[PDB]
Design a protein around this nucleic acid. Structure first.
Length: 60
DNA sequence: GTTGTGTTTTACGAGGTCC
DNA sequence: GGACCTCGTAAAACACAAC
């Protein structure tokens, strides 16, 4: 705990790209995106959790 | 050029599901 | 008995208004 570190443009690109392809992360694509983005698997799992909330919220 | 103040983006854990 | 996602929460870090 904690501390709040925003994700860079490059990381989000990669994360948004895979999400646009499949909303849900696999274990294999998770460890691929980690290597490519240098983000932790945990961070990635969390961003995905939070990204689904957003897609849900934004329906309006 | 900065004080208002929403809203959004990262964490995390109780609560419950699926192996 | 951990891996994991419904929602809830908390606070960083924006995004606008304004005088």
């Amino acid at each position: 705990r904690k501390k709040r570190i925003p994700y860079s443009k490059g990381q989000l690109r990669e994360l948004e790209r895979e999400y646009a392809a499949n909303k849900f992360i696999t274990k294999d694509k998770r460890r691929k995106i980690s290597a490519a983005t240098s983000l932790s698997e945990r961070q990635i799992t969390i961003w995905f959790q939070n990204r689904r909330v957003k897609e849900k919220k934004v329906l309006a």
